[PDB]
Design a protein around this nucleic acid. Structure first.
Ligand SMILES: [Mg+2]
Ligand SMILES: [Zn+2]
Ligand SMILES: [Zn+2]
Lengths: 115, 262, 140, 32, 56, 42, 391, 49, 69, 184, 147
RNA sequence: CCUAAGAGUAC
């Protein structure tokens, strides 16, 4: 009855975007980015790669409710470093690592004879 | 350079490998994507023509939706939500038809080998139900007494495991790290001795056991994850892992694309 | 910024208690007979055995420069110079009691996030300690 | 087993129960 | 006692409850159907003509 | 269905599980409401 | 809805599922579980009713009950166990989990507290992170049994300026008790800040417990060999004392206590000896249980369970009583046809010497069934009578 | 698997619940309360089948 | 009613391993555990899926069909 | 079970022996060509007896034969039982688990539960959902609830195969974890 | 509800990837709160979970008759012979992050009944509807759209 | 539509 359609977990609703960034007034040079139709799968990955950065002072996500598939990621970088730049670098590093892993797994699987 | 992989066992329906020099978050994200985010073909709509069996119509529909279907070239298909057709066409679906009649005096078992693909696949490698047993008969869909008849048509769309578990191609995914508990991420529950009461995992042979005198390595992080991915049959398990990595990369690239375009 | 207090202590007893990572140690100063220390230490992160000599220093800050917490903690960048470089185990806490033990002996209580410390001694050298935040630095 | 007059075990008694439920049933009182 | 001291009232719903650690103490979760059934009369005012018109 | 077909009702401490009930009625099978103990199962 | 706190003004949050959803802390005034309970929702239809409902019956305004001049809502169930486990001196949190927990506090000021340990690895203790949820300016000082200004056992509670100086946070601090954190906060910063404290504590503690894990199983009800042996020895010693008292009574050498007959005095002594036997066995079992025991942890946190639960599950269920007395002789002079006439031994009158782990013998099972039947009947009679008396 | 033991009344399966009653032709003696003038009462629910 | 297609927990397809299981039980006189191990059901989720199934469909099929063609 | 003097062994013993058990087993196997041996044969040869509460007043019953019939290093895991220090038994319980009713016979390990929990499950397994009859497709009942995949319990009792529970189950074997996972 | 009076409603439903998982990829079909165990003292629930785990692994049927000589120690030894922790605990990994849970989780099969009380037959709301003919008050019952 | 009875849920 009240159970929502499953495709709402990954399909963007009408009139809303994947990302929305709002500056955070608690601390300087800090943003809060709302990711829509996402979950812990991307959240923990992005958070870890952001914390791998040296100029990221703070980076943490939260899924405010398991009902709705969206999460808020707070990112605060040092002075003179745009938080969107930190997000860009984290995403770039994740993509590079995933590509290297895919290449390595393909090469390793090509070495089998009992498959 | 980057994450390193060394595979132990290769099988048609299982791959057991090691995932070294990689962060814990990346390994868990790959596991989650394999569980949920791989598109796969499964029956989605059931038009029932005749059912004189003892099973309910939606019961048989539920059984049919769980039938694994070949999805090797599922990337060539399109989602039914973003296709220009009315309800279903050849570019976004596979139309099968299950027709069975109980002309035998004994019970006749309606398997999935009697599922006949109607829509012309246009040379793709999708639609065929996955057969695994040596007998050649697929999943036991229904049974028929003499004189019972079951005629129905199925439309199968591509889908991911998030919308419904019938689209899940990953089955169970064994995932372990630090078999010797060197990172001290667990506090082993015990009555007398934690070492005796907790059986050593099969992966403990792949790491050096602790010296029992060395101080705790607080700088150590998590890596070298032992992962065994099982394949339901829709796609070979190597393709399961590869497509999981591909879909995770696609998600991150979509984040980058939206960020740049806004 | 300067060392509010500094001494060398010898550990007389290590009490594991009901913990696996924290132990409570009693230490006697090797220079002043009237100074003694009770301190909770993360032994998992900093092993301590009985009859061990520990150089202990309580400071008001870690920067080498003089004072010009209220400022958010930032991870130490590579190449940062601070007093913690000279010590093995650094904790940060707040002083929550100044007790008059005797005519000359006073005791100061510090709570580093729940790890408790009580430093007792004659007021002639403990007077620098005051009710504020402090850093406890220990080297072996 | 081999001894016909040997004493029965705690496992044997269930056989007896089976015989009971072969003749009485679960609603024997209503029908009787 | 059955019609004056206590009487059946309108604008009331009843259903099973469930726990939610992600709700505030003063908040209650209302099913969308129940919210669509129970109604409140809002007096039309220059301060809320726009949103009331949108709801209409 | 089986429990209903083997149900006994007592018209109306009578609600207590008596010692004589051993093996003739179920020691623990009774409604929680006003029929607690009055309704028994063989 | 036995009292005014069982009818309170909430704020609507529309959700896409078929059940009402309410905070865990507010279930205590409602006496509401989630095992099929139904609840009612009334909507005011005018601004006057709406306003007086929000300004008089609001949930934050009902935190402190006039019933016992103490807060009626507190931290309960999983959050209480998680807050006990989080504030232990062993609990140290790495940088990433600290950042996640800090972000989970909605009113977090945005400054990362300096870690309790800076070298060789920046670690925040659980008390440091939990103190973020506690509003600034709150001073609390409770001294438990045997605590000093230093806390060797980490009991008691000292919070200075909104920071937990020391003490394990458990039922006595964040629970619905007078003088606790809830009462102090709602009497110092107002009901709204108290509700905010509820939310912040629940969020941070639930996140930590989710990423730490808590469970319970059959192994938590098992005591080691020596403790089981001592429990059996204690039961045997108590049964021997009961036998000696029975011999004294049967020889008429027993003297009747003033105010009761010989039989009443004998039954009183037997019941007292068996009760202290069960208590001693349960205390032995509880002392045996390690701090890693999950039932032990739940009892220590005060979230659920008690000493009697541990005693009945692990050591000995005890004496089954009907109408305040031992099992009566329903048959002629005997409880069951499996006991000889005039048998007053503990096993022949309803003493369950086997724990729930070990399992109950058929006679003990029947006697326990009789006890539970009495309990259920008493519950029904009590609720009916209390309803009439309340009206 | 259906066991019987129930009637079909107007198409509905009706089961007769076993009605408990005091046994007949048994002498039962009961003490009485202090206010009542009778202290003990012996009764038989005499009945012929 | 009839053997489920997929194990509830993990999702391994077990609807095709029912008649093989019955043949192993009957013709080979194998015990249940070894027969389960032979089919590849190594996790106890699938083992409980196949082991505890009750094949009610035979009972339903004993009755005559309502609509016989 | 009737217990007689049994002068040959010089001690109290059950009237039923392995021969009657073997004949009952043979009759059951034939049912699943020798002379039939039904419960009526046990009744008509003085092997078992019917006792009501009035007669149950004036008898002494042995709970289990293997431990109470024969006259007088133990497993610490086993529960504590007594031998009653008396040999004057007149009858023997066929099985203690026969004191439970139909709804309580479904409970696994009811002796390891607090009695109100057993009462709750007894009153709650009637509300359990399963297959009430195999011919539900030819019955026009007012309300019917049927499980898709009824499963016989992994933890099953010996007394639930006389209730046809393994043929018409009323539940499913779900992989349960006992954890404070999310607080939900 | 289990076969031990452990009644309860579904709080929330997580997908397979979010549930905690063992090292063998097994995720639970259900997660029940530990706090239901100590107060209710349903030790039989835990014993039956252990016995069901052993029976599923070994293929035999768990003999859960009340008054037999089946001990928890024997079931634990049988479980230990199968390569698992004797007391049924399993090292589980958090679904969201993959990190090991600091406390191991009691894990295993258990027999659960679905009861007749569904939420769809109990949800009921009424802003305005049919009124009683006599007292001009709302009618009684959710089947009549009552108040 | 009314009345009555019964079963059941949460206390
Ligand atoms: Mg309830
Ligand atoms: Zn199309
Ligand atoms: Zn499985």
């Amino acid at each position: 009855m009240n159970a929502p359609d499953r495709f709402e977990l990954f399909l963007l609703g009408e009139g809303e975007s994947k990302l929305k960034i709002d500056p955070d007034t608690k601390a300087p040079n800090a943003v809060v980015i709302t990711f829509e139709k996402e979950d812990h799968t991307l959240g923990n990955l992005i958070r870890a790669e952001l914390l791998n950065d040296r100029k990221v002072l703070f980076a943490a996500y939260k899924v405010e409710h398991p009902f709705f598939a969206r999460f808020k990621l707070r990112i605060q970088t040092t002075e003179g470093y745009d938080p969107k730049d930190a997000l860009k670098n984290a995403c770039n590093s994740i993509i590079n690592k995933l590509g290297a892993l895919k290449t390595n797994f393909e090469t390793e699987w090509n070495l089998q004879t009992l498959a | 350079e980057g994450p390193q992989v060394k595979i132990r066992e290769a099988s048609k329906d299982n791959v057991d490998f090691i995932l070294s020099n990689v962060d814990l978050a990346m390994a868990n994200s790959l596991r989650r994507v394999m569980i949920a985010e791989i598109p796969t073909l499964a029956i989605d709509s059931v038009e029932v023509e005749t059912n004189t069996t003892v099973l309910a119509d939606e019961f048989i529909a539920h059984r049919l939706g769980l039938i694994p279907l070949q999805s090797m070239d599922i990337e060539q298909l399109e989602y039914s939500r973003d296709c220009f057709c009315e309800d279903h066409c050849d570019k976004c679906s596979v139309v099968l038809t299950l027709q069975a009649f109980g002309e035998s005096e004994s019970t006749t078992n309606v398997y999935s080998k009697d599922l006949v693909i109607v829509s012309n696949l246009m040379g793709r490698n999708i639609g065929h139900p996955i057969i695994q047993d040596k007998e050649g008969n697929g999943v036991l869909i229904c049974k028929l007494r003499k004189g019972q008849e079951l005629k129905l048509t199925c439309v199968a769309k591509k889908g991911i495991a998030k919308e419904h578990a019938k689209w899940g191609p990953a089955a169970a995914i064994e995932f372990e790290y630090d078999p010797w508990n060197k990172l001290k991420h667990t506090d082993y529950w015990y009555e007398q001795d934690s070492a005796k009461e907790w059986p050593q995992s099969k992966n403990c042979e792949y790491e050096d056991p602790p010296n029992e005198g060395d101080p705790f390595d607080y700088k150590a992080q998590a890596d070298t994850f032992y992962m065994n991915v099982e394949s339901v049959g829709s796609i070979p398990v190597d393709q399961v892992v590869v497509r999981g990595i591909d879909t995770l990369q696609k998600k991150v690239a979509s984040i980058l694309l939206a960020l740049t375009q806004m | 910024s300067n060392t509010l207090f500094d001494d060398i202590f010898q550990v007389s007893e290590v009490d594991p208690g009901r913990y696996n990572k924290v132990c409570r140690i009693e230490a006697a100063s090797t220079t002043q007979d009237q100074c003694k220390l009770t301190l909770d230490i993360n032994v998992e992160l900093f092993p301590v055995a009985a009859q061990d000599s520990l150089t202990v220093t309580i400071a008001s800050s870690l920067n080498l420069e003089d004072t010009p917490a209220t400022r958010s903690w930032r991870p130490p960048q590579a190449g940062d110079r601070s007093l913690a470089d000279d010590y093995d185990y650094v904790m940060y806490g707040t002083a929550y009691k100044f007790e008059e033990v005797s005519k000359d002996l006073i005791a100061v209580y510090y709570s580093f996030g729940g790890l408790l410390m009580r430093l007792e001694g004659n007021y002639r050298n403990l007077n620098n300690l005051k009710q504020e935040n402090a850093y406890l630095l220990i080297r072996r | 087993f081999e001894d016909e007059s040997a004493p029965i075990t705690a496992e044997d008694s269930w056989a007896v129960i089976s015989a009971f439920f072969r003749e009485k049933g679960l609603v024997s009182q209503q029908l009787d | 006692r059955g019609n004056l001291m206590g009487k059946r009232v309108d604008f009331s719903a009843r259903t099973v409850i469930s726990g939610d650690p992600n709700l505030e103490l003063d908040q209650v979760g209302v099913p969308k159907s129940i919210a669509k059934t129970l109604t409140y009369p809002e007096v039309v005012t220059p301060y809320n003509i726009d949103r009331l018109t949108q709801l209409v | 269905t089986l429990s209903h077909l083997r149900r006994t009702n007592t018209p109306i401490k009578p609600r207590q599980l008596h010692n004589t009930h051993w093996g003739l009625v179920c020691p623990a099978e009774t409604p929680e409401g006003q029929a607690c103990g009055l309704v028994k199962n063989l | 809805s036995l009292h005014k706190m069982s009818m309170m003004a909430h704020r609507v949050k529309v959700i896409p599922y078929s059940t009402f959803r309410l905070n865990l802390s507010v279930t205590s005034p409602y006496n509401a579980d989630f095992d099929g309970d139904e609840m009612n929702l009334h909507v005011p239809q005018s601004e006057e009713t709406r306003a007086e409902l929000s300004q008089l019956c609001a949930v934050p305004l009902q935190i402190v009950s006039p019933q016992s001049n103490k807060p009626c809502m507190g931290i309960v169930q999983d959050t209480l166990c998680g807050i006990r486990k989080l504030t232990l001196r062993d609990t140290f949190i790495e940088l990433d989990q600290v950042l996640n927990m800090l972000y989970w506090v909605p009113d977090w000021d945005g400054v990362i507290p300096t870690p309790a340990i800076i070298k060789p690895k920046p670690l925040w203790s659980g008390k440091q992170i939990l103190s973020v949820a506690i509003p600034n300016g709150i001073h609390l000082q409770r001294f438990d049994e045997g605590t000093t200004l230093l806390s060797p056992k980490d009991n008691g509670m000292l919070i200075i300026d909104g920071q937990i100086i020391f003490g394990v946070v458990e039922k006595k601090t964040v629970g619905s008790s007078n003088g606790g954190l809830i009462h102090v906060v709602t009497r110092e910063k107002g009901p709204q800040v108290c509700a905010k404290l509820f939310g912040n504590i629940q969020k941070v503690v639930n996140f930590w417990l989710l990423h730490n894990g808590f469970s319970t199983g059959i192994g938590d009800t098992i005591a080691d060999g020596p403790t089981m042996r001592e429990i059996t020895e204690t039961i045997a010693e108590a049964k021997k004392k009961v036998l000696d008292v029975t011999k004294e009574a049967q020889a008429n050498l027993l003297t009747a206590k003033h105010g009761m007959t010989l039989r009443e005095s004998f039954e009183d002594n037997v019941v007292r000896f068996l009760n202290e036997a069960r208590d001693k066995a349960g205390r032995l079992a509880e002392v045996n249980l390690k701090d890693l025991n999950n039932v032990k942890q739940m009892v220590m946190a005060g979230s659920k369970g008690s000493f009697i639960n541990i005693a009945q599950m692990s050591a000995c269920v005890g004496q089954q009583s009907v109408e305040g007395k031992r099992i009566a002789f329903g048959f002629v002079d005997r409880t069951l046809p499996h006991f000889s006439k005039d048998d007053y031994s503990p096993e022949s009158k309803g003493f369950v010497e086997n724990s729930y782990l070990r399992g109950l013998t058929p006679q003990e099972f029947f006697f326990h069934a009789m006890g539970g039947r009495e309990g259920l009947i008493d519950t029904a009679v009590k609720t009916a009578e209390t309803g009439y008396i309340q009206r | 698997f259906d066991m019987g033991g129930y009637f079909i009344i107007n198409g509905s399966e009706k089961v007769l619940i076993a009605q408990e009653r005091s046994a007949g032709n048994i002498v039962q003696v009961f003490k009485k309360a202090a206010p009542s003038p009778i202290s003990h009462v012996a009764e038989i629910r005499s009945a012929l089948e | 009613m009839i053997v489920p297609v997929r194990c509830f927990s993990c999702g391994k397809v077990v609807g095709d391993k029912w008649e093989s299981y019955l043949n192993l039980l009957q013709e080979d006189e194998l015990d249940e555990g070894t027969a389960l191990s032979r089919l590849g059901l190594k996790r106890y989720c699938c083992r409980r899926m196949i082991l505890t199934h009750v094949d009610l469909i035979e009972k339903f099929l004993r009755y005559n069909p309502l609509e016989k063609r | 079970f009737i217990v007689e003097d049994d002068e040959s062994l010089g001690h109290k013993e059950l009237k039923v022996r392995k021969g009657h058990i073997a004949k009952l087993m043979a009759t059951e196997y034939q049912d699943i060509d020798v002379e039939e041996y039904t419960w009526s044969s046990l009744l008509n040869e003085g092997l078992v007896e019917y006792i009501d509460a009035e007669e149950e007043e004036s008898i002494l019953i042995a709970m289990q034969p293997e431990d109470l019939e024969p006259a007088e290093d133990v497993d610490p895991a086993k529960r504590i039982r007594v031998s009653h220090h008396a040999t004057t038994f007149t009858h023997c319980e066929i099985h203690p688990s026969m004191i439970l009713g139909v709804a309580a016979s479904i409970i696994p390990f009811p002796d390891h539960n607090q009695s109100p929990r057993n009462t709750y499950q007894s009153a709650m397994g009637k509300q359990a959902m399963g297959v009430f009859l195999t011919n539900y497709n030819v019955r026009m009942d007012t309300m019917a609830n049927i499980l898709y995949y009824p499963q016989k319990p992994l933890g099953t009792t010996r007394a639930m195969e006389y209730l046809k529970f393994r043929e018409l189950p009323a539940g499913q074997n779900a992989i349960v974890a006992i954890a404070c996972y999310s607080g939900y | 509800a289990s076969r031990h009076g452990q009644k309860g409603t579904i709080g929330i439903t997580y997908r397979r990837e979010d549930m905690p998982f063992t090292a063998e990829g097994i995720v639970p079909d259900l997660i029940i709160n530990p706090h239901a165990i100590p107060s209710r003292m349903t030790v039989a629930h835990l014993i039956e979970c252990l016995l069901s785990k052993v029976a599923a692994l070994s293929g035999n049927e768990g003999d859960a008759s009340p008054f037999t000589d089946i001990t928890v120690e024997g079931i634990s030894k049988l479980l230990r012979e199968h390569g698992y922790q004797s007391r049924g605990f399993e090292v589980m990994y958090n679904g969201h992050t993959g990190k090991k849970l600091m406390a191991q989780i009691f894990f295993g099969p258990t027999y659960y009944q679905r009861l007749r009380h569904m939420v769809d037959d109990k949800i009921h709301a009424r802003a305005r509807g049919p009124m009683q003919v006599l007292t001009r008050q709302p009618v009684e019952g959710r089947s009549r759209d009552g108040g």
